[PDB]
């Protein structure tokens, strides 16, 4: 009957079109801040001196980019890991020159996507569900925090964060391979098994349900009209799908339990993305992937090359050409 209790009843109401909740009190202002700043910076933002060497990189559509080449460029290397809000910048043009919008978007996005995760817990609690959908969303949240926050922290600069652009993402990937050999890191290998396996199991589970649908339609209408929303009966023969996949490989290698099967669909990509998020987070502190350069040696002592050595020649080509004016000394220790 009080004013706060009527506000609490509206915030936690499951009858709103979108659930707000108390995490939405952090989710909606931070993500709409980051969305507003991203759209304005992607369309029209002046070039950013990313490498701190007064060589400004254009990233917006009004400075000659397209959708692929356009980016919100990371902060200046001269800033480093320093906090650069607008009020610490003496003019907005100085803030725009030094890659200020990147720090505003990334910090509001990472706060807002952690609050999106807690909002996913919160609605499940108000709906009487089991809680752990937001644990599955923690795997892309850990990945976003690794490339936007954790890898800047270990390298000591927001300039080494992943650019908010399509071609900036590929620039982030190639320099990471030259400096950390992520392909030879087993945590990226588990991540590739997470997304190759996850899209395998998605196409596998989606095939066997669609293969074993029960006749409820004619040849003229769509097959999806055989399902009614809110029906209690099963819409596909799971015995027929188990008998198919049990004959495709062999019988003992197939889930007859649909609850164990859907748990395996949740676990395989999420654990795979968790591990590759802890690959980026541990290559942030330069615990790099496997180095097998000049490891095969013949009897005289000469180096016999392997495929890791040919991979090393491609790593050498990226690292001698990346940030080509930024280096003054023979080791890229940053």
């Amino acid at each position: 009957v009080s004013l706060w209790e009527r506000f609490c009843a509206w915030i936690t109401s499951t009858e709103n079109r979108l659930y707000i909740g108390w995490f939405g009190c952090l989710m909606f202002p931070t993500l709409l801040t980051a969305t507003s700043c991203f759209i304005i910076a992607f369309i029209a933002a002046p070039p950013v001196d990313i490498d701190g060497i007064r060589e400004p990189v254009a990233g917006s559509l009004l400075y000659g980019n397209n959708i692929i080449s356009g980016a919100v460029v990371p902060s200046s290397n001269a800033i480093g890991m320093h906090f650069y809000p607008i009020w610490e910048a003496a003019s907005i043009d100085e803030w725009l020159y030094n890659g200020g919008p990147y720090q505003l978007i990334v910090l509001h996005f990472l706060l807002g996507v952690s609050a999106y995760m807690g909002r996913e817990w919160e609605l499940s609690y108000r709906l009487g569900m089991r809680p752990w959908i937001f644990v599955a969303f923690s795997a892309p949240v850990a990945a976003a925090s690794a490339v936007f926050l954790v890898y800047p922290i270990g390298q000591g600069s927001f300039s080494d964060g992943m650019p908010l652009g399509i071609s900036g993402t590929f620039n982030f990937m190639l320099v990471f391979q030259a400096e950390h050999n992520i392909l030879m890191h087993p945590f990226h290998m588990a991540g590739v098994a997470g997304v190759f396996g996850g899209s395998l199991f998605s196409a596998m589970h989606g095939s066997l349900v669609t293969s074993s649908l029960i006749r409820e339609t004619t040849e003229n209408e769509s097959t999806n009209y055989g399902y009614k929303f809110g029906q209690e009966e099963e819409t596909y023969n799971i015995v027929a799908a188990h008998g198919y996949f049990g004959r495709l490989i062999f019988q003992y290698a197939s889930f007859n339990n649909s609850r164990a099967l859907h748990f395996f669909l949740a676990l395989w990509p999420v654990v795979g993305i968790w591990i590759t998020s802890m690959g980026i987070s541990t290559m942030a502190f330069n615990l790099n992937g496997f180095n097998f350069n000049q490891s095969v040696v013949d009897s005289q002592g000469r180096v016999i090359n392997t495929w890791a050595d040919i991979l090393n020649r491609a790593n050498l080509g990226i690292e001698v050409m990346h940030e080509r004016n930024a280096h003054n000394f023979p080791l890229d220790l940053a």
Binding site: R17, I39, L61, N65, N66, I67, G70, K228, F229, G230
Partner: peptide
């Protein structure tokens, strides 16, 4: 001049997302 096309395609894509969320066909039982 092509940034006019790039802006219109992105803003036009977000307008489809707006109508897909708030003007969706409501799922109804029976």
């Amino acid at each position: 001049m092509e940034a006019l096309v790039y802006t219109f395609l992105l803003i036009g894509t977000l307008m489809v997302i707006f109508f897909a969320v708030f003007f969706r066909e409501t799922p109804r039982i029976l």
